């Protein structure tokens, strides 16, 4: 089997990706941020407190006609942003792009954090990281992946994410015609349950290339590019202007800048996100202070390569017996 689905940025800045997702019989179709940095299903629900929802469409469990309560079990979930989500669990049928998983666990939120509610756009999260992470208790459950895998031509699927446009996840195929040249595959550690890799090092607009290995997951939950200090001291001392602002939460440079591009490596091919991509407009509406998006993971405890960097490449996620990333240029 395969699937094909379309996944469509939530506003002009690309700050996260929609895809939609059909859940139960008959369809209900709930349009889910795709998280390669997390393991979960969860979305808003006919069990969400009322006063946390605010434009979601949820899902109605009593109305599908292949729900079923996985009886005791529970989750809850925080994310690195301080953002949380718990509830109850479903079983039901879901289906991503035409590819259709039987009996995915489906968390139904009884409670989410501000930031979901005060996001319109997003109906749920769907994790695509191993399944070891996910919150279910007192039975761990699979991601929709790890679900599918047992039906996928390949076991892999792939991340295609648009600058300010639309993109693709394909899940059991390699689309050749998505990409330029060839892909670089990479070594994964699944040791903390994230598609985390080593990248061999960056390059800073026109700038010699630093060979130097850098750890970090590929997460297409993160909205920004979160590396070492030292790689992005070095990065925003090219732009007049910019500084860590303490008031912020991070580098801010001038809205009159041109910002030069980032290029990470992957093995020994080179990935280049242009200047603008790394452009997160004002800090507030019609202020000249603009927001970066490369950002320090200092207080972070891993290195994040998110939107910002996976949206310049394309991105195959091998979920093979030993998984691996690969990247091709786009
Ligand atoms: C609550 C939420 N924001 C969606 C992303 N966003 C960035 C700026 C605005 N929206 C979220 C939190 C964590 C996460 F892994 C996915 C989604």
Do not use: M
Not at 77 to 86: A, F, K, L, R, V
Not at 120 to 147: E, H, R
Not at 233 to 239: D, E, G, L, N, T
């Amino acid at each position: 089997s395969t699937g094909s689905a379309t996944t469509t940025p939530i506003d002009s800045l690309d700050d996260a990706y929609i895809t939609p997702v059909q859940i139960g019989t008959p369809a209900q179709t709930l349009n889910l941020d795709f998280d390669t940095g997390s393991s979960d299903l969860w979305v808003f629900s006919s069990e969400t407190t009322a006063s946390e929802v605010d434009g979601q469409t949820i899902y109605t469990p009593s109305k599908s006609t292949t729900a079923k309560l996985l009886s005791g079990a529970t989750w809850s979930i925080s994310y690195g942003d301080g953002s949380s989500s718990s509830g109850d669990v479903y079983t039901d049928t879901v289906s991503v792009g035409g590819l259709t998983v039987t009996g995915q666990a489906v968390e139904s939120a009884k409670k989410v954090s501000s930031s979901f509610t005060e996001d319109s756009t997003i109906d749920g999260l769907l994790g695509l990281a191993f399944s070891t992470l996910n919150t279910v208790s007192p039975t761990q459950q699979k991601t929709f992946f790890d679900n599918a895998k047992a039906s996928l031509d390949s076991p892999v699927f792939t991340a295609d994410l648009g600058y300010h446009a639309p993109g693709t996840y394909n899940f059991g195929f390699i689309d050749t015609t998505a990409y330029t040249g060839s892909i670089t595959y990479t070594a994964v550690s699944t040791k903390q349950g994230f598609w985390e890799w080593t990248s061999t090092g960056y390059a800073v607009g026109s700038g010699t290339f630093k060979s130097t290995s850098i750890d970090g997951i590929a997460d297409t939950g993160t909205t920004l590019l979160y590396l070492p200090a030292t790689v992005v001291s070095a990065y925003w001392a090219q732009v007049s202007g910019a500084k860590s602002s303490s008031s912020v939460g991070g580098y801010v440079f001038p809205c009159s800048a041109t910002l030069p591009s980032f290029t990470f490596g992957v093995g020994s091919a080179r990935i280049v996100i242009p200047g603008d991509y790394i452009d997160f407009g004002p800090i507030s509406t019609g202020s000249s202070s603009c927001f970066g998006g490369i950002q320090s993971s200092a207080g972070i405890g891993i290195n994040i390569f998110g939107d910002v960097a996976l949206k310049a490449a394309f991105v195959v996620f091998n979920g093979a017996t030993t998984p691996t990333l690969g990247f091709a240029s786009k």
